[PDB]
Write a protein that binds this DNA or RNA. Structure first.
Ligand code: MG
Ligand code: MG
Ligand code: MG
Ligand code: MG
Ligand code: MG
Ligand code: MG
Ligand code: MG
Lengths: 99, 71, 107, 59, 62, 26, 50, 538
RNA sequence: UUCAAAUGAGAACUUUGAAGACUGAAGUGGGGAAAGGUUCCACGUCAACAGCAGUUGGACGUGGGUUAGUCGAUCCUAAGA
């Protein structure tokens, strides 16, 4: 075991000296995209100040739909005012519409 | 797509929806001065046509990629 | 204060009358309450081997008596709300009968 | 910039065909560049030049 | 970390069910780095991922 | 305004010989 | 269905390309009133009906 | 901690750098000035030959005794407006021609690769042994050949703004060398320059450099620096990789703004003994500037479709930097093998051709060059996936540009400090404030430079040396002295220039500069400079 | 259903490991037809939705992915139109 431990020696290198504690070196994208990947949402807004302004505008716009508890911008279910099958009843001595 | 360049000497192109394999092979040979072993095609779910063009062993698809400019 | 003792817990009277699907989970909770009572610690951690010993005969086959080693130790993390915690280990023995509370000499 | 129709109208059929081929090659190169750079304003003027050459030839 | 994808890839690469692959709980970062079947094969080779044996169904009483 | 003051200051502030080597190729 | 007609697949490709939120630079234009995609479609909400 | 082994490693690296600089100077002279060679060598061929020469020389030193050695700064040949990053590969000549067809002739020397008379060629190269890096950079002038003089000599000296820039760079280099050597003898500092009991300060460095530049009517390019060098931390990629600690003086557009209005570097330090210093100075000529303007930098891309400017340079950078803090397993086997080769280089910028097994060439053959290009094709295929996952980044090609102050003042920025480049891949240049007091960001400044009709490009001259402040035990003669590992009168011999500007002897700083020069020339009771000698080859 | 660790501001509900169970081959397994149309997979990621919760998701944002002379359609005719 002592021979194995003396054989396993950790030797520092230039990568350990330079990049040992640092990180990043690259602007982390907002959508997790690769370098040559298109961003449908943000490619038309070059600077981050305007990007954040647009983000705040969208977040403010979302509030009424969120209060109405929609699944998203694609949730456009419409309920009728009154249901005829619930308001079309005279129950005689015979067949009914439900049990 | 770039994996196939080294895997099977295959170039991947987006081609016209009106083009068949004969036209694709002829167009590739005219534009890049290479010989084509075979052409496979598909229609993508976005509505455009993709062509896998395998060149003969006398030509390297890597050189054609470098010449086109994407690498 | 760091300390280590070995106890016997009587799970038979504690699980007396408990529904069959809840016997082993209630044994887990009773062991936690036992360690809290004997050590004064709200933070009690059970070894997975102790969990195996509890669940060895299924959900309704918990042993009548179990021999436990309870160690009160210091909580190294600063963000923790308590400075001390208990760690409960199983003591696999020939029989859990006739055994008294003892103090384990830590070395 | 681009090309101008009155300057194109002084050239012959072979010159216009050669210019159209050169413009199509440039358009192919620009479409290659577009895969990495989404904003490329030269595509518009090259396309308009191609349309102008075709219009002059047909006239 | 979320190793669901690595678990599925390990099952497919070893050729057994997902119930039969063991991922080392201490090499979490090393397993998390593995995004390809090639890296999964490397992990299997070096022992971070292990194939479990089948549960026995003895025929002695039969 | 500080920006106005800086811009005003910038506008107010903007509004033989020697021979080395010789005839040879080193 | 897996074995679909080309007409159906063409309509499906168009629906896929239409499935997106607004680009963000639209919101910054002068006198813009388009604040969300009011015609967005989801597979589990409104069926395309062929 | 300076020691015998550390000093020997630094000296060996400096000797190899000096020999390489002599080799490239000889090749350029024999191709363009002597004209005895049948074929004129081009810039990428010269760079490749330089790198091969450096590797072949470094093969014989510290073999199996040093873990890491190689080329620290790849060979760079910058012409005129181009101020750095020009190391094109041999497989990009036709690419450059095709990319730059239909453009102007302003960058014709860089596009073709063939030098022309009247060109300022800045040659930069560096060598490291065991992390101890010695870097050299020298500006030279290309001259026409006289046909009547029996010996090959220039027809006439260089004149004008280029001569002003070369003179300013040379004199500033010598003055900074003398001032830094005065740190080991604090009693020899002139009273007019500073306190006799006081040492050397970054403020003194900055005021001397700015005085020389203003006297010669030149601007300090924002890439210039006078900093301290440690092991593996030599600023080999300074604007790219962030450093924990910095001890030096740098020049920026913010410094230009502060002068006009009169990790973070600061000129509030004192030079200490037993230290290694790097001095890189770039002077841009202001001959064609009829007003007061700002000197900044423009990055070169390979997209011809981004604009319609006929005076635009379109090129691809040839040097890459590996980011060891990022890890991502690549899909391509070619990419994985390339990354394995890249990780062997270390923390210094590298070329793709440096990773080839054929390189360096033993017997320079056409078949060997063909094998090198064949390797380069697959290297580019691997590099495409390496760069796309942010494992390696590019070192940019930069052009010095001049922007007048009136356009900047008249311009409006609705965002001010808040704006920044969100599409920039590199973190450090993406979030930048070139004008903190005016609140103008880098993206806004690029917009101003593109919108201004009178934004011109300035010719740049460069001089860069490495020095060591040897103490009494470190030095041979038992007294502290300055060891210049790279540069001097032998390798960096100035070209034949003539300028109509000069230092005005009525200024206290100018008198201090003259006294520094006299005390340096005093070899008995002055300063002691030991210049590293280039080793013989044949 | 339980235990420990990891992640996280926050874990009954996420990940790994440790246990206890269940579907029991007319399956809670492995494929297809009708129908759906991207729901498949990766990265990012929690305002709304998942009648508790949520770091998770068939959700939200950005992309990748469907390769045929031999499998089908295409051809033949049936009741019929
Ligand atoms: Mg098909
Ligand atoms: Mg009861
Ligand atoms: Mg049952
Ligand atoms: Mg059963
Ligand atoms: Mg809920
Ligand atoms: Mg899924
Ligand atoms: Mg989705």
């Amino acid at each position: 075991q002592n021979r194995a431990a003396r054989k396993n020696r950790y030797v520092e290198r230039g990568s350990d000296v330079v990049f040992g504690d640092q990180d990043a070196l690259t602007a982390s994208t907002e959508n997790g995209v690769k370098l040559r990947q298109t961003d449908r949402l943000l490619d038309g807004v070059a600077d981050g100040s305007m990007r954040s302004k647009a983000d705040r505008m969208a977040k403010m716009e979302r509030r009424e739909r969120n209060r109405h508890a929609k699944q998203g911008e694609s949730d456009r279910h419409n309920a009728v005012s009154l249901s005829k099958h619930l308001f079309s009843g005279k129950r005689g001595v015979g067949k009914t519409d439900f049990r | 797509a770039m994996k196939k360049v080294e895997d099977g000497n295959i170039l991947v192109f987006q081609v016209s929806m009106k083009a068949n394999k004969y036209q694709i092979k002829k167009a590739v040979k005219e534009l890049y001065e290479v010989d084509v072993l075979k052409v496979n095609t598909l229609v993508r779910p976005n509505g455009t046509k993709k062509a896998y063009v395998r060149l003969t062993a006398d030509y390297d698809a890597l050189d054609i990629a470098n010449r086109i400019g994407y690498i | 204060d760091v300390v280590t003792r070995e106890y016997t817990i009587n799970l038979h009277k504690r699980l007396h009358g408990v529904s069959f699907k809840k016997r082993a989970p209630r044994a887990v909770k009773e062991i936690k309450k036992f360690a809290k009572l004997h050590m004064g610690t709200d933070d009690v951690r059970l070894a997975p081997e102790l969990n195996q010993a509890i669940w060895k005969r299924g959900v309704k086959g918990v042993e009548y008596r179990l021999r436990l080693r309870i160690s009160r130790k210091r909580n190294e993390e600063e963000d923790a709300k308590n400075p001390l915690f208990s760690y409960v280990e199983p003591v696999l023995v020939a029989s859990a009968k006739g055994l008294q509370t003892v103090v384990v000499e830590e070395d | 910039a681009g090309v101008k129709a009155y300057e194109l109208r002084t050239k012959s059929k072979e010159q216009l065909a050669s210019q159209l081929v050169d413009l199509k090659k440039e358009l192919a190169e620009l479409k290659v560049q577009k895969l990495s750079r989404p904003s490329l304003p030269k595509i518009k003027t090259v396309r308009k030049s191609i349309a102008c050459v075709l219009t002059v030839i047909n006239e | 970390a979320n190793l669901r994808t690595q678990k599925r890839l390990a099952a497919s690469v070893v050729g057994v069910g997902k119930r039969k692959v063991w991922l080392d709980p201490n090499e979490t970062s090393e397993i998390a780095q593995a995004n390809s079947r090639n890296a999964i094969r490397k992990l299997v080779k070096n022992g971070t991922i292990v194939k479990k044996a089948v549960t026995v169904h003895s025929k002695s009483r039969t | 305004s500080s920006l106005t003051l800086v811009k005003e200051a910038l506008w107010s502030v903007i509004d033989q010989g020697t021979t080395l080597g010789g005839p040879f190729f080193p | 269905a897996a074995q679909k007609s080309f007409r159906i697949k063409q309509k499906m490709a168009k629906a896929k390309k239409q499935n997106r939120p607004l680009p963000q630079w639209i919101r910054l234009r002068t006198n813009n009133t388009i604040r969300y995609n009011a015609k967005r479609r989801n597979w589990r909400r409104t069926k395309m009906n062929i | 901690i300076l020691q015998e082994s550390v000093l020997n490693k630094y000296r060996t690296a400096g000797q190899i750098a000096q020999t390489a600089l002599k080799y490239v100077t000889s090749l350029i002279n024999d191709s363009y000035h002597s004209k005895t060679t049948q074929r004129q060598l081009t810039v990428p061929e010269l760079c490749l030959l330089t790198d091969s020469f450096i590797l072949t020389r470094l093969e014989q030193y510290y073999k199996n005794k040093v873990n890491e050695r190689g080329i620290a700064i790849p060979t760079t040949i910058d012409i005129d407006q181009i101020s750095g990053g020009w190391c094109p590969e041999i497989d990009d000549t036709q690419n450059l021609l095709n990319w730059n067809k239909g453009k102007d002739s302003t960058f014709a020397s860089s596009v073709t690769g063939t030098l022309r008379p009247g060109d300022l060629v800045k040659i930069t190269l560096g060598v490291h042994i065991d992390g101890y890096t010695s870097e050299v950079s020298h500006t030279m002038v290309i001259y026409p050949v006289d046909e009547t003089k029996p010996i090959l000599q220039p027809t006439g000296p260089l004149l004008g703004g280029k001569a002003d820039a070369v003179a300013a760079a040379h004199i500033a280099m010598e003055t900074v060398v003398a001032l830094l050597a005065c740190a080991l003898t604090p009693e020899k500092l002139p009273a007019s320059l500073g306190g006799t009991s006081s040492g050397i300060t970054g403020q003194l460095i900055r005021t001397i450099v700015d005085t020389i530049a203003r006297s010669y009517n030149c601007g300090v390019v924002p890439g210039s620096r006078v900093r301290r060098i440690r092991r593996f931390l030599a600023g080999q990629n300074e604007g790219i990789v962030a450093e924990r600690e910095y001890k030096g003086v740098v020049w920026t557009e913010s410094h230009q703004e502060a002068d006009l209005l009169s990790a973070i570097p600061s000129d509030d330090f004192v030079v200490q003994s037993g230290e290694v210093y790097l001095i890189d100075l770039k002077m841009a000529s202001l001959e064609h500037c009829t007003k007061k303007g700002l000197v900044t930098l423009e990055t070169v891309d390979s997209y011809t479709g981004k604009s319609h400017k006929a005076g635009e340079l379109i090129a691809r950078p040839g040097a890459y930097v590996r980011d060891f803090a990022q890890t991502h397993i690549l899909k391509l086997k070619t990419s994985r093998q390339l990354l394995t080769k890249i990780d062997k280089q270390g923390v210094y910028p590298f070329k793709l051709s440096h990773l080839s097994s054929n390189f360096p060439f033993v017997h320079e053959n056409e078949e060997e060059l063909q094998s090198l290009k064949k390797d380069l094709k697959s290297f580019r295929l691997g590099m495409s996936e390496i760069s796309n996952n942010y494992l390696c980044v590019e070192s940019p090609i930069q052009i010095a540009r001049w922007v007048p102050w009136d356009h900047i003042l008249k311009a409006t920025n609705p965002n001010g400090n808040l704006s920044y480049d969100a599409t920039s891949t590199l973190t450090l240049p993406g979030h930048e404030l070139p004008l903190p007091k005016l609140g103008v960001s880098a993206i806004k400044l690029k917009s101003l430079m593109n919108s201004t009709k009178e934004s011109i490009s300035l010719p740049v001259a460069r001089e860069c040396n490495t020095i060591v402040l040897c103490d009494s035990s470190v030095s041979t003669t038992d007294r502290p002295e300055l060891l210049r590992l790279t540069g001097g009168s032998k390798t960096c011999q100035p070209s034949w220039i003539h300028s109509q500007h000069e230092l005005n002897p009525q200024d206290s700083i100018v008198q201090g500069i003259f006294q520094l020069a006299t005390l340096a020339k005093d070899k008995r009771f002055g300063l002691l400079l030991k210049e590293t000698q280039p080793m013989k080859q044949k």
